[PDB]
Amino acid sequence: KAGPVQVLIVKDDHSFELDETALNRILLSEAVRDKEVVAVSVAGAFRKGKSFLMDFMLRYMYNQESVDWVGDYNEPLTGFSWRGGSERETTGIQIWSEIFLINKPDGKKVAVLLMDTQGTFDSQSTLRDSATVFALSTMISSIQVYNLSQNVQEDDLQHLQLFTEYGRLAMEETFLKPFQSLIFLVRDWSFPYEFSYGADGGAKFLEKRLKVSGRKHIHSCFTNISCFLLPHPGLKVATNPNFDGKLKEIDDEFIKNLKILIPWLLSPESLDIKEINGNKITCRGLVEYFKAYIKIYQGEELPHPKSMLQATAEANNLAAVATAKDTYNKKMEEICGGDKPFLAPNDLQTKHLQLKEESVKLFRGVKKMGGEEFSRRYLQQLESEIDELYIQYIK
Template sequence: ILLAEEVRDREVVAISVAGAFRKGKSFLMDFMLRYMYNHASEQWLGDAEEPLTGFSWRGGSERETTGIQIWSEVFLVDKPDGRKVAVLLMDTQGTFDSQSTLRDSATVFALSTMISSMQVYNISQNVQEDDLQHLQLFTEYGRLAMEETFLKPFQSMIFLVRDWSFPYEFPYGQEGGMKFLEKRLKVKNQHEELQNVRKHIHSCFTNISCFLMPHPGLKVATNPHFDGRIKEIDGEFINNLKILVPWLLSPRNIDVKEINGSKITCRGLVEYFKAYIKIYQGEELPHPKSMLQATAEANNLAAVAAAKDLYNKKMEEVCGGDRPFLAPSELQARHGVIREEALQVFRGVKKMGGEEFSRRYLQQLEGEIDEVFVQYIKHNDSKNIFHAARTPATLFVVIFVMYVAAGITGFVGVDIIASLCNMILGLALITLCTWAYIRYSGEYRELGAVIDQVAGFTLSPSFVSMIFKIIAQRVKILPYRDDLFCSLKFSAVYKEQYL
């Protein structure tokens, strides 16, 4: 989903809904999906008779969603400044159900909070002290992260209070919600533990807001066959839903995911998913330092991926599949320039962990770029018509030379050498036919590669130099043979007189 061509390099907005189980999270997410598909229309809620579809949901007392579910489509949205960003919607398993351990609930909540740029904390009826204490599980990570980067680790937290029963104290909507939340999170003469919870929540989130929603009505709560039709939902709930969803998802309000002050792309978010899932695979909840370490690793890996992507794109423009053969010296020069650009991209990304921590990822990037360059060299060489014809040309030369050598040595009576030349000629001819079959059929490619390597070595300066040295040494030590000289002279006179 996140690595699709059209979205992987887009900045990502990750919106998740988390909270206790059976409190209507998936129900809300499906209305958010309707808005994303129909936001251009004022009638985005659809027909009053239309069942609600999207993320799986149902009424009842047993859980429906398990784990973290990501909608299969990433939505592209134009921000007011002209940027096109990718919007990702995530539904999460309800916390503290009868089938999950404390670790399961904490893991899901932690992952969704760390991955999302906007976390909707779905709460029923009121913001109670235990709701705030559930957030405290992650405040230690936030404190450590701030010591490292001096930035707040999380972005937007929206307290969504469902089934709000006191509109006469604080009216439904955002305005009433903000007044209510301000009072609830105010640090005053409480116990020190309660004060610390509130201080940490304020220090860990860049934006904190609240929205109060009315109850959807008795038909929704008590009808076992309710399928989400708008006509069965209380009118006051619908009116506030028309305010809530556009407020959450309007291009002006959505926040691009940031870590350590750097905006994250869809490709980068994949690295964070991998890193976080890895540390949560153990039996115990990870220590906050482990979470910080995973974030730093993913941060550096995302920078490596961005730099490699730049290198590959620019090298494709230089010597990609549709580009002509490039002189090796020119290819080397262009590689050097593009390689340095890619390294600058890596260095320019804000990274966690410090310079020493990032150095090994820089070395990893350099090694991977050099490995990719070797492949580009081979790809470029394959476009050289002379390189492609090297093997058959070499074999033809061997066949021709052996044919001439066999004729000359046979003519002068050196039959052993003539037989050896004929044998080499036959082997070269068989090798040529084998090579042609491999190229035509695509079979036995390993054997074809060996033939190409031998042919390349045969034409290499080192091999030719070695042959000449051997010949020179043989000539120097070859004794003068009167009988051979006389035999050659007699043969020449005989042929001149009688043939």
Template sequence: MAEQIKVTRSDSFENVSKFSENSDTMMSGDAKLSSSEQYGAIQIVKSEEKHKFILDHEALERILLQDHIKDKHVVVVSVAGAFRKGKSFLLDFLLRYMNFTYIEEVPNGDWMGPNDVPLEGFSWRGGSERDTTGILMWSHVYLATLTTGEKAAVVLLDTQGTFDSESTVRDCATVFALSTMLSSIQIYNLSQNIQEDDLQHLQLFTEYGRLALADTGTKPFQRLQFLVRDWSFPYEADYGEEGGRKILERRLQISEKQHAELQSLREHIKSCFSEISCFLMPHPGLKVATNPKFDGRLKDIEPDFKESLSQLVPILLAPENLLLKEISGVQVKAKDLVQYFKSYLNLFSGDELPEPKSMLVATAEANNLSAVASAREMYSSLIVPISSRLKTISSSFATQL
């Protein structure tokens, strides 16, 4: 099935904007990033004409098959939701935290940085037109020490916004479903409130997990983090995690008064995710919303927003909160994630949306191919040297005779 993927040259590496001058971690092995290619957002899933999505598997392998990364269990954090609602803007603050915590390793410091420094990383801009297309992966994979002592690889994904004027419903479903299937923490970025249509879209995008749920007895997806931006009702529920919990309980509550369809919708969402939480964010301020020259400097952002941001990001990315990616209850390594990307993208390569049944088949295929690759790797590292040595001994013995 993997052969069906259309291969593209990794041209996205030629125009990578640097995020950090820290290049201590150089890459080794066959999958390498040169120093000029480090620290950028790489488009690994691209949108083509006729609403087709293709995988730049060369770019993906360069990131995930680095020698110091490929055998690490992986944490995948993705941000998805409607277009022009600040997903990439949020991701760049996640990058600041990751650099501060897992590269600079400064304990209990101010990870948000100086007030007068522009925000860099994933491309973002103000305005009404879409900016991100397809799925982007940050080229630097962070190594984080979990509370168990294990070192895990942390991957950040940015996704094309849903429901812009150029995307079909199928496009939206494809990108959202892919990011949900591949992430361990899916941030569902919403504006102002959790509305009924937001839940309906979520049901549509997660429909592909139904069969996996029925066949394996486990929930197909892991953590869903509702993130409500520009929350305007702090008198009903406070900004932050506690207010989010209150609103989430109300929105997902099931009662006898509800229509059966509304009850089914809520049951479906709860059955698809192992963990669901919510966080309420205030508006970042008029300078952010209306100034076309705004470049992310903290001095231009409202204090309430910065305070909420300082609470939100550690909830997602602190070592004790990182969640290893699991598929069918098995933890996934970085090298395995490459195969899942290939298998899942093939699932959406046809003209129609796949049946939910196909997800289970694609997962099984990826599991099998990953197991074969691991067995081949073990054979090469253990059996081949022994076989070679035995041949040498046999040849030596024959010479003596």
């Protein structure tokens, strides 16, 4: 009892495989199934310290009220763990097997769901998958902790909007925002002199970072958006898989901020209840929603992502292809359409071949991306097109 449980997962064959029975044996029990739920997710790439963080989340949820829940400064990090043995990189969602019930300030009794959500981003291949998982994760989650490494890279925002897009695609679309809360968690922040560790520093840094979209429609998607800056834990944590050592051996700033961060996220008040279309949700509602969403993504198709490179080339060649088709069409009409139509089912061919060739030389001569085998496909397009402009011969 009490361990991590795989609930969603993409397979090699890009097949999203949900585990409904395990999804049931934890969230559909008579004990939680009727309580309104708060689902906390920690989402990011593989090997970014998500499980390390989620362990401390446990340390707090299991010793919540009381103590140095963070633990004895001189004993090792003991207890329940999401870290398994030989870690395999996987795309999907894991949840913690034990739901927590705890008491809100307003006497409410509430079910607390932790999810690890993990994606890959190693190729146009795995991207689509990851975005789909992140999309799902976020639309069943009450708080998405987007766990990012040193900064907020163009990538990270790009990817964020993307999976944000995927979510709306599967959603009705009220006059409420689609999702609840987002938290940009920046790990191993190393510029406390520019922006300070924590939420204050986060806020500011995020501000300045977001003002670089010549937008923040991320704000259209989320009711609440915050940012926390977390320090490097130190080399012992950083370079040791399965860390093991005393609290002491972790950087002191790191732990001091962890201490504000976990309760910041998980303290009874800050605990925030999942909801959809303006309606607070119950563990069971969740499961059926999760199932609903997944059902969709399986039926109708998710737009394959087109990368910056592939796309920038496609635009490069097309511009040649069009520049060329242009100077052909213009010279042709100059002498073939309007008050000009002096007939002649030959010489029509002659000027055509004459011009078509000038365009081809025009195109082919242009410096362009991707090279021969790639551009040739566009040269062909250029050709079959001016031939369609060649049915500019009627009468």
